[PDB]
Amino acid sequence: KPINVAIFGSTGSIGTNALNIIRECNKIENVFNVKALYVNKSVNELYEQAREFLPEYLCIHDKSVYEELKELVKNIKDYKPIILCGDEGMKEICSSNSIDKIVIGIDSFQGLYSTMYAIMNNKIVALANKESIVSAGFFLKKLLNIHKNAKIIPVDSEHSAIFQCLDNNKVLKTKCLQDNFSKINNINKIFLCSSGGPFQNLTMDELKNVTSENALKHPKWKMGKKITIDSATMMNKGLEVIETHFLFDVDYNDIEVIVHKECIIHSCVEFIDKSVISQMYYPDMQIPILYSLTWPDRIKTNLKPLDLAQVSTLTFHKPSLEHFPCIKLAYQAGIKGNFYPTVLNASNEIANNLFLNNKIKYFDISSIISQVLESFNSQKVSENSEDLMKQILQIHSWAKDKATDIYNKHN
Amino acid sequence: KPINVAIFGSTGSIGTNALNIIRECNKIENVFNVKALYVNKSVNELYEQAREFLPEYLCIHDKSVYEELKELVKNIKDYKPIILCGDEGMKEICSSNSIDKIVIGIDSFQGLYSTMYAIMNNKIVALANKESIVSAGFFLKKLLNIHKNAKIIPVDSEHSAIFQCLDNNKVLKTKCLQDNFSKINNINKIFLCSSGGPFQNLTMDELKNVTSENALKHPKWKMGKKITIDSATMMNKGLEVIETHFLFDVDYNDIEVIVHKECIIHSCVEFIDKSVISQMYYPDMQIPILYSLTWPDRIKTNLKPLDLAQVSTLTFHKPSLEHFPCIKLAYQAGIKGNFYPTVLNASNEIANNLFLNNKIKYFDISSIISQVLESFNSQKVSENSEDLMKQILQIHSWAKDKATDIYNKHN
Ligand SMILES: O=C(CC[C@@H](c1ccccc1)P(=O)(O)O)N(O)CCCc1ccccc1
Ligand SMILES: O=C(CC[C@@H](c1ccccc1)P(=O)(O)O)N(O)CCCc1ccccc1
Ligand SMILES: [Ca+2]
Ligand SMILES: [Ca+2]
Ligand SMILES: [Ca+2]
Ligand SMILES: [Mn+2]
Ligand SMILES: [Mn+2]
């Protein structure tokens, strides 16, 4: 019987990849009902999607375009959706008994907030937003212990890969973000594969002078600017190291970053017997998104089969921490624990955007982050969920301000 | 609590690797009990193993070395094993209530009979003898349908790999050699990895000249002569294609042989969504053997962790069927069904031995096997288990004789 899905951020990359794979899978067999779509402010794309999927719910965050949506929707004949606005509309979707699975494809406050509401309503939450896990991992873990039937299923490609390598008979005795997930699943170590970004062959001298244009003009996957800069510094991978720690409870000393430039093996799991299982496919966000929606089952697709003999050659090498010091900073913050990951994420948000806007240089990114981390002091971690969310927000804002102050002091 | 194990073929490659990993796993805790050791005739080696492991049962096939074994074992103080012989001894071990799992590391008839008795006693059978599956696959399927608590767990490295790639939550709802195994496991296709053997890069003119000495001196792994020659002709992979079909109920058109000369990825499974899972490690029979004894759990080993950066490069290519025609013969025999696999296996046993002994040339191997296949006339499959076994043995003998007659004629 059907899989009832809501997509939060339906016009973004995750959202459209999700609708695409749902559409194709549904051509083969009708398994998916799209029950809700939520967008920030892209009222026109949202209308086109509603015309096609006819969800029970439409919600737009920006009440300024609220009226226009209602107007556009009247054209669709035989169609009376519940049309909502803002955070209240998001809460209403997450509390719907009609909805089983929620795809979070938005960033920032909206992304953490909608994750939280989806967890509080005991839903299966398909989560691509690695910054929410890195910054607010303690809050999510706490929430997932309150709301026992809620589950986060990883969509970030490497984390999906890890999850796909597992025996569901063991996964189902635990869940992601739980202490002891790795022990229950007999996980010893993770190989976290990376594209390596555009700068793997550059020298230190070259890196000293690279620009955001260099990072953006020739990326490894056509993506948003921020994640593109993170891929270039390998701070994306550093964030994904912490994401691996929180999702799977794997110790930092058991997470190894490996540069796999062909981007066919998506990541690998070493079990306690030293057997290694890996997941592989062409680079394509459809498989991670689909698995998040079908887990613990798989359904038929019409995706192109992997031609291993055509790919011919897979390569692996260790990243240089001297060339990609952001990786080292992520491990440092992770190992220190506490709210240092919150600080790392927030400070990187600022330093990333400074580099993007040509205000600092490549090695200034890691210098700023490093100086912010050094200025933080560990905080008593609140046992109360409300207080803990407030701590995370306060530390997040402090850390962004601190990064900005460090930039302005030097500049 | 301990897992009680019998090893059939304790002094061969599988048996010694089995005892090696059991010994390491038993250092602190009693994880396994070695209850029984069986060999064909290596009484001196068996005695050394008995001294260490003190099994309840010893068994030798060759009755002519019984008195020798009895005299050796006298030297072991306060040890009173049950010392058995031949097929009757195999039956008594397989029947013992004190034995849970049986490792079959012997070939030919002793391998088939021991497998059969293990199944008849509803044991877990860790099967490394692929020829039994190829020659007697439908008979084993029939037996497994009668003896509903017996399970075959694959130990052949590539088939262990396939098995490990599956999701045990689905595996537990079926069993190897059971109709519908691939449907239940959402299997679409198999990538069956091969070393390629010593002759993989030879031209056709060079290949015409190869000898058994060439195959034996530069092998891809240190192993028995028979399998080394099959690795060189890629008849080993052909046999493994049929093994794949029977174990996993995967159609022949969905099994793709891939030459992966690094021998790190052991095989891969494509599921119906087109996601591919693979299993990898250094070549080492310990992981396949251990997993067959621990499945569906895993236990800690002290094996060297895979260093993928050090490996650095993995390669994949299609084998040339003009150079390795034994592969094509195996697909043809398998697709024909009936007793064509029995005939394939039996004719190969002769042709391999002829080549080993310098009596025929490389392309004569596939020529003889092809001629025996063409000569065989399909037979109605006996419905009775005992009748079917008799039919198998008859056709096996016929095909060896026919192969010999063909060699004799063109000599
Ligand atoms: O986090 C990201 C983006 C950055 C990383 C990457 C990985 C593969 C290609 C290019 C870039 P990095 O450079 O940090 O290794 N991703 O998860 C890939 C999304 C696209 C994708 C790739 C493989 C499988 C499915 C989807
Ligand atoms: O059937 C065999 C022997 C023959 C094949 C092979 C494969 C890898 C190296 C050498 C030879 P083929 O040449 O037919 O591909 N085997 O299962 C490998 C046993 C050794 C082994 C290898 C990998 C993992 C664990 C154990
Ligand atoms: Ca004697
Ligand atoms: Ca598995
Ligand atoms: Ca098919
Ligand atoms: Mn990623
Ligand atoms: Mn093999």
Side-chain angles (χ1 to χ4, degrees), chain A residues 60-82:
Chain A
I60 188 145
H61 185 257
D62 183 1
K63 56 159 178 283
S64 79
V65 291
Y66 186 23
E67 280 288 20
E68 183 183 349
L69 177 66
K70 285 190 286 289
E71 285 181 3
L72 280 166
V73 160
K74 257 158 283 167
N75 293 284
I76 312 157
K77 223 198 74 170
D78 320 320
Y79 182 46
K80 246 275 210 315
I82 303 148

Side-chain angles (χ1 to χ4, degrees), chain A residues 226-265:
Chain A
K226 192 283 188 173
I227 187 162
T228 297
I229 295 301
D230 283 348
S231 167
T233 64
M234 296 196 74
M235 185 54 98
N236 181 64
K237 212 56 37 170
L239 295 168
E240 285 180 357
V241 165
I242 299 167
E243 184 187 10
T244 302
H245 180 72
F246 277 101
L247 285 169
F248 309 122
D249 201 28
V250 176
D251 297 344
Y252 285 101
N253 293 343
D254 297 320
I255 305 166
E256 175 182 347
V257 175
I258 192 149
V259 175
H260 172 49
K261 74 176 188 293
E262 301 80 12
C263 297
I264 302 294
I265 295 175

Side-chain angles (χ1 to χ4, degrees), chain A residues 164 167-170 272-281 297-298 301 303 306 312 314-316, chain B residues 164 166-170 186 272-276 278-280 297-298 301 303 312 314-316:
Chain A
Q164 289 186 56
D167 291 317
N168 291 304
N169 51 305
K170 293 315 179 59
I272 58 172
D273 57 354
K274 266 38 99 67
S275 185
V276 178
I277 307 289
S278 74
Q279 182 264 340
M280 67 187 181
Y281 188 66
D297 202 6
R298 297 184 183 277
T301 74
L303 285 176
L306 185 65
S312 174
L314 305 178
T315 61
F316 302 90
Chain B
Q164 292 185 60
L166 307 177
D167 173 6
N168 281 334
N169 200 48
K170 302 288 204 212
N186 296 321
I272 59 171
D273 50 4
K274 299 332 138 65
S275 189
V276 180
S278 69
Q279 184 269 334
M280 71 186 90
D297 301 317
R298 292 176 185 277
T301 78
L303 303 172
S312 131
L314 306 174
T315 70
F316 306 86

Side-chain angles (χ1 to χ4, degrees), chain B residues 301-340:
Chain B
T301 78
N302 289 127
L303 303 172
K304 175 185 199 298
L306 181 67
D307 186 341
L308 199 52
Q310 188 178 52
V311 171
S312 131
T313 303
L314 306 174
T315 70
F316 306 86
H317 72 259
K318 286 205 146 270
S320 167
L321 292 179
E322 171 178 51
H323 296 74
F324 298 99
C326 283
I327 297 164
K328 177 78 207 172
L329 299 175
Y331 274 90
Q332 291 178 335
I335 290 158
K336 270 271 180 189
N338 194 251
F339 296 97
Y340 284 91

